[PDB]
Amino acid sequence: AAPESFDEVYKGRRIQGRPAGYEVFVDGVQLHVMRNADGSWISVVSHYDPVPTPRAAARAAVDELQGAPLLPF
Amino acid sequence: TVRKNQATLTADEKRRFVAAVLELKRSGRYDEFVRTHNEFIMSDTDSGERTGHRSPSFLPWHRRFLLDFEQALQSVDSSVTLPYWDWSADRTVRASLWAPDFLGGTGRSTDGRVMDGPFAASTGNWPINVRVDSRTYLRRSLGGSVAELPTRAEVESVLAISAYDLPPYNSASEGFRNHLEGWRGVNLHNRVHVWVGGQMATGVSPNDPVFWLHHAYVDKLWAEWQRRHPDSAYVPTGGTPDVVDLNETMKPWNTVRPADLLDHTAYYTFDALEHH
Numbered sequence: 001a002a003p004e005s006f007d008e009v010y011k012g013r014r015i016q017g018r019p020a021g022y023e024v025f026v027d028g029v030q031l032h033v034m035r036n037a038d039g040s041w042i043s044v045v046s047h048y049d050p051v052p053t054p055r056a057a058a059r060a061a062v063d064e065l066q067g068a069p070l071l072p073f
Numbered sequence: 074t075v076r077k078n079q080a081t082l083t084a085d086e087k088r089r090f091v092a093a094v095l096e097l098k099r100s101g102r103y104d105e106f107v108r109t110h111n112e113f114i115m116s117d118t119d120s121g122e123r124t125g126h127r128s129p130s131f132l133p134w135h136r137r138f139l140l141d142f143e144q145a146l147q148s149v150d151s152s153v154t155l156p157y158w159d160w161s162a163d164r165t166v167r168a169s170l171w172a173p174d175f176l177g178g179t180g181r182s183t184d185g186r187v188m189d190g191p192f193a194a195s196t197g198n199w200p201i202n203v204r205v206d207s208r209t210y211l212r213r214s215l216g217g218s219v220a221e222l223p224t225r226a227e228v229e230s231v232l233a234i235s236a237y238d239l240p241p242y243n244s245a246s247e248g249f250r251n252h253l254e255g256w257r258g259v260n261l262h263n264r265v266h267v268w269v270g271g272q273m274a275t276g277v278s279p280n281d282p283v284f285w286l287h288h289a290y291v292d293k294l295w296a297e298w299q300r301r302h303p304d305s306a307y308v309p310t311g312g313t314p315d316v317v318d319l320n321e322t323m324k325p326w327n328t329v330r331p332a333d334l335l336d337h338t339a340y341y342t343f344d345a346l347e348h349h
């Protein structure tokens with residue numbers, strides 16, 4: 001079963017996730033994410049650094065972006 | 074045709090490498106390497122087709138990708154070869170690698186922007202065009218997101234693993250390839266990307282010229298592993314869904330197989346490579 005959906009404001013920016021296998025958005029812009037066999041997640045802006053959940057990947061992306069808009073992939 | 078430790082380059086070799094990389098960028102060729110790599114990063118998955126990463130072909134795929142890049146450099150200046158970065162030895166920000174005459178240093182704290190070296194945004198010579206993070210300047214945070222590069226003792230532990238790879242041939246595997254890649258164990262290759270930070274931590278990691286020097290040393294570790302384990306070879310060897318078997322061809326080239334890339338000496342040698 002896929003992770004639960006989420007929606008929160010993290011460091012001033014809206015992050016959302018939902019089962020689709022799973023989609024994440026930063027301020028309404030889709031962020032490419034991927035699930036590893038062991039259940040961890042990465043995103044295209046943190047793609048060598050597994051984190052435990054898609055919300056953690058969205059948060060890691062906000063950290064990475066330092067305020068910058070995400071470009072569509 | 075000799076790949077040298079970056080720390081040993083002469084001033085003239087550094088100048089010619091930088092100029093050749095900047096000309097590939099100016100002509101638009103460099104960015105298409107960045108784009109190819111990101112496409113494979115985003116498509117290689119543990120339960121589906123996987124070629125460039127998280128799979129046995131991670132090593133021959135990057136060997137051929139680096140050969141493509143080196144050949145492009147040699148079309149600009151035939152004397153240039155890819156150097157390699159031994160991050161187990163040159164492990165601090167004061168390594169000459171990060172000097173203004175080579176790759177430039179770490180990014181400033183406000184926005185990660187690299188402020189010196191030939192690839193600093195201020196030079197006008199290194200626009201970041203293929204991107205996901207919308208910013209257009211090279212960024213790094215050396216040692217920011219993880220605080221140590223692998224040590225030699227860690228590298229040696231990985232080199233001692235005898236099996237090249239094991240089912241399920243993905244990020245969950247035991248074996249040499251996945252411990253070198255870093256998804257399991259003490260973590261060599263993925264940790265180095267995390268350590269550099271900035272674009273090197275993303276699917277558009279070839280935006281940083283250190284990408285090539287990192288992968289040339291990963292590639293050297295594959296060659297060292299072979300010398301330690303003459304009785305071990307690439308697996309799988311036939312009939313494996315979603316994974317490139319030994320004699321199967323690899324995208325995007327379609328005309329080369331892992332079998333064609335196991336012996337690096339067909340293409341280059343190293344300044345030094347231990348014999349078994």
Ligand SMILES: [O-][O-]
Pocket residue numbers: 126278
């Ligand atoms: O893997 O870069």
Ligand SMILES: [Cu+2]
Pocket residue numbers: 110125126135
């Ligand atoms: Cu790669």
Ligand SMILES: [Cu+2]
Pocket residue numbers: 032033034043044047114115116
């Ligand atoms: Cu991905």
Ligand SMILES: [Cu+2]
Pocket residue numbers: 262266287288
């Ligand atoms: Cu890499």
Ligand SMILES: [Cu+2]
Pocket residue numbers: 303349
């Ligand atoms: Cu022997």
